Design a protein around this ligand. Structure first.
Ligand SMILES: Cc1cccc(O)c1O
Ligand SMILES: Cc1cccc(O)c1O
Ligand SMILES: [Fe+3]
Ligand SMILES: [Fe+3]
Ligand SMILES: [Fe+3]
Ligand SMILES: [Fe+3]
Ligand SMILES: [Fe+3]
Ligand SMILES: [Fe+3]
Lengths: 294, 299, 299, 299, 299, 294
């Protein structure tokens, strides 16, 4: 049994209103507020949510939620964790209910990042996805999770082994001292996870979100520029995912990467030396201060 | 040769703008578009700037019907056909065209006295994507099919049929109903594209220019959503959910803020290549709230 | 320009209604439709109210042939073509049209004296789905292809060909057979849609207006079912199962209650885009019970 | 309006029937058909009774070219076009048509004096399937494309082009070659269906009515089989395997028993929608055995 | 009836051949073709010998526009239409046609005085496959769509529209822009195939015959490659990457060696079946380096 | 875990310039020169290279590179090798980097042919394949490797067993003393490997390369004839792969077989007695001096 997608993220944020303006107003996510005094939700599709924003006063990643197919698969993964000697907690019904899931296992990755494994997310079919700004299309999420993340790992090799145990597959995909970032996938999304990208001052570097329609990316890009939000890498294409993407600052001081047209991960491992086109460095200091093309 | 290609727009006279916004956007899912005109707003269903203009003039009826042609050459040909038939028409100026948000325009009347417009080059607001007035599972069916269809008043069914044939619509009688006096009601339905029909008439006496407008969702769940809302808001349903034998669409008929009917629907089939007629509907469409001009027994 | 689009219906004169029900429904799978008319019943093959009218008048022959056109404009054009050719015709009233269960109708005769009708707008009973008179694996092939095809009497093959070309059918000679006196039999086959042919003639002397009617099943197993029943009920088979080289359909020819032939079939190919002719059949169609006008050696 | 639809057949005058059987059946894979006529046999390539008639008359050239039309109405229209152009023609009797194994026929000559026939209704022998004169991996390409294509003698290229345009073929110059005197050779190629061309001319002086016939296999391996046999039997190859830039077909050119050329091929592309021209071939087609009228340098 | 089928070629007057090679091949990916002519070279984009002729004559503007028709019959018909409209034209000789590398040619001028050519039978160099002047991920989009599109000078928009309609192009106004004096700019766009447009004009005052040429890549990555190079080589970009609402193509506008604009692009949609108009672009196309005649605010 | 393709070849050559003229100028490969004093590269697709030419002064095969999906699969194959008792070396990072791969195992086949197993080839997406002469199309390589090779085996049965362990599948496909050549596949390419073809005076007999477009083969064939390069077998079709191919000499004195339209290997083993058509013997002495048709 393997994890099947990157189901949700929990984020600790200092400014909820700024996040609504950003994630809804620009990116097109739907804000969902169920009356909880300490959190709101960002929705991207049928699921009740893909992102939880905790009114916490911090500005980093809080937890990463990996999906499995069902209770049997969860138990099998948990049995594997026990076998390998990795500490985990079987969460209570009320903890599962908090995350809007039926079953939950809580643990950590070798870099100490809070990691949860779940099945049975809450799906709000009866209330159709309604975007925070006008959208030409939708988000790419069905069977692919909410997007992908680059996270902090002090031991790249331990992290690779850990995620392989969860069922992710991948290896080093770039050679840039040589920087050799590792990219991993668990479904049709080129990668759900990456790490080993040099020094990070937060647990998360970026989250990439994917539009179905190129025009929604153009819409988002125009707005980011109109609102003078920092762009760290201009519109371009990485050699690995071949997606058209840009990297811009979010209210928490790390990066979101709106994009379009990502390909599936190759059946067999490849590596690259540089990006295809674009991705010119602009505003430095967000952890992506490397020449991606040369 | 040149023919009308779709029912492009409707201009409506309304007495209450606030109720219409609540109704057309809040229930039906249309997008309200306000360009700051002191006397009008618009309802948008797709890429086009609008499909419906609401004129806040205090009346509650149809103001004008806009039929689309492919281009200026086609308009010119149609106008020439009108001139040959001795049908009076107005060639709109650039300011008249700009008003309707079109490139070129001809204004006239059908035989029933319904203001009729023929135009090309709708304004399309590609840059600001359609954003529904309530959450939607899908979209509206409009592309190459126009906004929907309408039943309108015709005192002379045959003259109306001849007129619309000249415009390029095709059709004939699709139903035969038994009337009280031993006469037969024989409503005419006409099409100019893949939409089963864009136009119907000959349903008997009407106190308004328009009986109903039918609008179509791509997704069944949007019909369910709209139906649940109509029922919740205690809005009159004249005909319950069902299917006519002609379009085979799943639809209901309900009151709008102007006292006539809208018919939200789903799954409309294309017009058959060859003329057919029917004596009844397939299922549902049971009569409920009476007095909207569709009190006839459909089964 | 306007052309007949399919063989829509046949009116038949019969002497025994009870035997025809047993035969057409009980064996063939057609649906019996009785509207309470004292002198007639109907056989239904699909969505249409009927494809065949049985007139219980005591005769046993064809009464009329109904050819479909797309609509009233097309009918009008065809009528104009008849008037130009100096062919006499009757424009049916609304009551005449209602009788045939159509919207509009023209009545005339072909050159062989066969009563011929041209109509638009068949009554379709969508609300009560086709329900076969015996269990069926599939359905009949009719959609855009009419009820099947017929071989009819023509004393003048060339005049008949010219007449039917005017109607919009296309075709020519498809077989050449050697006759006893050194002459050649050259039957003409004609089509107006995807059905290989709707009409054939020039098969020589006939004592009735009609030689056969061919009906087509969607599913081979329905042909097998019907064939097994015909054999069980000891009904005369004039030509055993086989295939003509023209339509390439798997068919047999058997007696009906009126003493002429029905040809149940399956897998009929479309008419070739360009004219072809043949000297024999592919396989089977061996002569069995003689005296039904098809005693010719097909191989 | 009406146009020729394919190159249907060729009649050939031959001096040696035995060698032609050995060649066309034994190497090429055609089916020999002998109906017991004392003076002729046939070569069959598909469902049709034949594509080629061999007249054992002692000459070694083309006897006649048969172009197909869809039917008798189309023939009539073409004949009317010939009469309007003041082109003399013969309307064949039923016995003349029977000879060619067709339903209707018109006989005339092209401007180069090549006997030209226009016909409808080929005899198709569906009942006895095509059986090749040597084992075949596949079949011939003929359906809706005729037997292949031919290069024929024309003393007046422009008159020939005008004549064939009247017949309904389309085309123009497809190559420009540099000639010794500073002139340019500009061969014309023409098509009437999906076959890149059915006809070409203007290749300069010819001592026979026909330069070559091209025949196409469905399967590459049949070309390989035929090529291996030609080489084994020491039959002259004038142009080795290669590809012309126009049809992009993989072909070679070899001698037949009458001293002219057959061009077995595979993978012919359809004629481009719009006229193109070329200055050379793609690959191969290197000159080998000279003196068959194609000694020109193709690259 | 007969119509132009694509924008086939452009002849350009240039002052610097070396810079144009560097630009069109080294950046854009076109193939340089040098046939040893002392005064000209060619740029190739596909199978055709060339799409663009560069005349090293010291000027820096458009020299001629070549529109394609399907064949000699179509050319003849178009010429007849020009003669009927009282439009003067030159029927090119075989040497004139050979110069342009075509089979037949007509030379004239549009109402703006732009030299306009109508031709059939381009020379296609199938034997030497397209080999780009820089490494390419894909190819150019040209097949049945011509080389791209152009904006050209027209002092009389209406006369220009009428002229091009006669040629067989279709279109009308696609944008309305607000001008400083309260007037409206209304550029006309026209198409003759699946390319959204081949031609546009009415963008106001121009100091050259041509404002821009748009060329389309099959693969997005080639646009990225070309864009990266333009930026690296410090070549002026007048409009940044973006999308017009009409063609919905992803494009940028940059300077060429002659001081006018090329617009490399990707993902152009087909022209809508029916006329549409817009008030702004979708995204990007922000004004950068000014003074190339496109300083207008597109959003 | 199985090998997935014949990823690359290393060739020892005496004349680099003659190889550029031949492989680029005629065949359409792309020459890649990264400044190494002792080697250049032949490229056929997205990959940095498919062939390495070592300026060595020899004229034979140097090494055969077999691809696996990733590091896990490499380790599993290596564990299988250890189990069967076959000697192998886990190559250093710098050895892996030399071959432009992420991970490498070096060994030999039973015939002593140098054999490498790898994952993660260098892919140069940003610099599109640009052919050494004009091409109508491209090479068939995606998921099929660079082509196929016939190599020297003194023990056919041991070689068959060895390659089965690597994951190749096949058996004798021809019966021509009876010559019974063995053909083996690991993907959609009819075969990647063959052996048991009689006496060989080099380690490699031929390499077959496949064009997508028939016209590129005609182009190559014309040039081979124009340049008077020895053709040993004329244009023809083998019964097994049913590809249209010819066999011609290369600057190293063995053979390249340009071809088109190869079919996939049958699901089930077949054998043949002769070729379909063509392949007539021409210039003898290249190790293919047999009557293939009779
Ligand atoms: C930031 C970054 C750099 C290189 C490759 C990637 O996939 C990526 O996300
Ligand atoms: C040389 C050779 C001979 C026979 C079969 C083959 O596949 C082959 O490559
Ligand atoms: Fe990323
Ligand atoms: Fe309705
Ligand atoms: Fe029959
Ligand atoms: Fe030829
Ligand atoms: Fe443009
Ligand atoms: Fe081989």
């Amino acid at each position: 049994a393997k994890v099947t997608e990157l189901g949700y993220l929990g984020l600790s944020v200092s400014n909820l209103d700024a996040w609504r303006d950003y994630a809804a107003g620009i990116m097109g996510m739907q804000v969902v507020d169920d009356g909880e005094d300490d959190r709101i939700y960002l929705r991207m599709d049928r699921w009740h949510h893909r992102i939880v924003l905790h009114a916490d006063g911090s500005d980093d990643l809080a937890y990463i939620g990996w999906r499995v197919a069902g209770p049997v698969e969860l138990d099998e993964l948990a049995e594997q964790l026990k076998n390998a000697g990795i500490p985990f907690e079987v969460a209570s019904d009320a903890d599962a209910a908090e995350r809007r899931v039926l079953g939950l296992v809580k643990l950590h990755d070798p870099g100490g990042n809070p990691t949860e494994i779940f099945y049975g997310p809450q799906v709000d079919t009866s209330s159709p996805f309604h975007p925070g700004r006008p959208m030409f299309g939708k988000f790419v999420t069905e069977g692919q999770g909410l997007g992908h993340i680059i996270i902090r790992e002090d031991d790249v090799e331990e992290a690779t082994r850990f995620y392989r145990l969860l069922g992710l597959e991948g290896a080093v995909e770039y050679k840039f001292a040589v920087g050799t970032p590792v990219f991993m996938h668990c479904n049709d999304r080129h990668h759900s996870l990456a790490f080993g990208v040099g020094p990070m001052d937060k647990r998360i570097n970026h989250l990439m979100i994917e539009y179905t329609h190129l025009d929604d990316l153009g819409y988002a890009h125009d707005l980011v520029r109109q609102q003078k939000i920092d762009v760290t890498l201009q519109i371009g294409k990485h050699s690995n995912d071949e997606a058209l993407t840009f990297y811009c600052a979010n209210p928490s001081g790390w990066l979101w990467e709106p994009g379009w047209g990502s390909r599936p991960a190759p059946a067999q491992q490849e590596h690259y030396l540089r990006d295809i086109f674009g991705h010119d460095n602009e505003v430095e200091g967000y952890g992506l201060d490397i020449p991606l093309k040369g």
